């Protein structure tokens with residue numbers, strides 16, 4: 540699809556069988572989701588944005604469907620204000636910016 | 639242009655007679671720039687991201703050129719860790735996500 544930016548670019552994702560809403564975010568290097576359960580082991584990461592840093596849990600090689608497009612990659616979980624799909628997964632689903 | 643998301647989507651902007659690098663950020667409602675002077679009225683605003691909120695000055699009706707494309711809109715100025723072009727100006731240059 541082509542998504543214009545007059546409203547937030549919120550899409551439905553599916554992860555661990557569950558539907559969630561997430562923001563397609565070209566300003567995020569990494570995908571970060573609100574608190575949830577994921578399988579396997581996690582590693583620590585500190586991520587920074589507007590108001591400073593948060594600690595998150597890094598899960599690798601997680602299947603996730605984004606607007607119907609399949610991806611498998613790194614998902615960070617922590618106290619983000621909103622679910623954000625970052626460039627690590629936007630690249631997997633073939634996303635570009637165009638103007 | 640078509641802008642790949644393998645790297646951060648950084649572009650050159652011109653604003654208040656200054657050239658600056660900024661991130662094209664579909665996850666930002668608003669354009670937020672590191673400390674700088676702009677002309678005209680402003681009012682204080684809190685904006686919130688990963689890590690919490692920062693106080694910024696909100697300037698309205700500011701001309702900007704992004705990648706050669708002229709636009710006008712609101713610019714927030716304050717202690718953001720990096721210059722971000724948000725949707726309020728991305729719409730004006732006809733920027734879309736495509737996949």
Ligand SMILES: COCCO[C@H]1CO[C@@H]2OC[C@H](OC(=O)N[C@@H](Cc3ccccc3)[C@H](O)CN(CC(C)C)S(=O)(=O)c3ccc(N)cc3)[C@@H]21
Nearest residue numbers: 564566567568569587588589620665666667668686687688
């Ligand atoms: C809060 O009230 C609602 C509006 O609050 C937000 C939305 O609109 C407003 O405009 C300015 C601000 O927007 C943002 O801050 N946008 C961020 C996403 C976001 C969106 C909503 C809430 C919080 C964050 C941004 O696209 C990504 N961030 C990096 C960037 C800013 C360099 S990051 O998130 O820090 C990040 C860093 C690393 C990874 N790996 C992942 C993410 C305000």
Ligand SMILES: [Cl-]
Nearest residue numbers: 612613627628
């Ligand atoms: Cl990844």
Ligand SMILES: [Cl-]
Nearest residue numbers: 710711712726
């Ligand atoms: Cl505006």
Ligand SMILES: [Cl-]
Nearest residue numbers: 543544729732
């Ligand atoms: Cl349009």
